[PDB]
Amino acid sequence: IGVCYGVIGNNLPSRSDVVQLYRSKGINGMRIYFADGQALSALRNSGIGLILDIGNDQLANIAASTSNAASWVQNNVRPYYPAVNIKYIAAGNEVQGGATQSILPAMRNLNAALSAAGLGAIKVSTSIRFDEVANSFPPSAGVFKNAYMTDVARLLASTGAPLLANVYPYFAYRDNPGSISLNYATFQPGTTVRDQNNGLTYTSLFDAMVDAVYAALEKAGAPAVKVVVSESGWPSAGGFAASAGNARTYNQGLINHVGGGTPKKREALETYIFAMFNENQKTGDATERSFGLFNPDKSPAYNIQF
Description:
Layout: E1 2-4, H1 15-25, E2 29-32, H2 37-42, E3 49-53, H3 59-64, H4 66-76, E4 85-93, H5 100-116, E5 123-129, E6 133-134, E7 143-144, H6 148-159, E8 163-166, H7 169-175, H8 182-186, E9 193-194, E10 201-202, H9 205-220, E11 227-232, H10 244-255, E12 271-273
Parallel strand pairs: 1-2, 1-12, 2-3, 3-4, 4-5, 5-8, 8-11, 11-12
Antiparallel strand pairs: 6-7, 9-10
Helix pairs in contact: 4-5, 5-6
């Protein structure tokens, strides 16, 4: 499985220390949020598959021209591939506003540049959050609420690239403690929901969520498009339901689950746990600083067998 690697803290390890920890624990996937040169160099011949986000601040620059995208590929990708196994490139992460207007042309522009560079194995996609999907209940009722997402699904369909989704049962649960049980949320026996539309049964909030993305994809006209869960995790402190036991239970649960897929698609699901270390400098809710599997000093936040 993979682990997202965030560096928004003032007390984290060196990139090479990081890569080493990964190889020790047997983690075979990494997501990085910008073209981090030190991470990339450290990653050479490490055998770790990678999701490379371009960085939202780069979206407009890349969307402008193919020469802009070629220059980015030349500096940030060409020097590391194929030694570094970059599997995907996320042209934007949870972009909002008029910026969404830039995601399709940046996606095209990168596809053209990778092509001419002779790097067509690398696939181009975009990272979204679940709040992109409406009428998620029953999961079969899922539909993309924004118009631009259909444009994207179609491009992914024709290019053979998957969709990267940030799925967090924690946020769903946190918002709706009354309607949602901790068991259902953390992969524990107890609850069963039946999708009337297709008759599938659901025992976990995770499955129900992923299958809602699949519902939406199909409606968009992109049935064969796969989903890569580009983020999923549970905080160990800073708010409601945040605790090591809950965080241990969710993540281990997650690791032991994804290999069986979901009721709509029983194939193993590619998933990235958020995140490797707690980022002591994040803003927003107190929980943001407590999503790590490890403590800044490389010590296990709680025990997880990968």
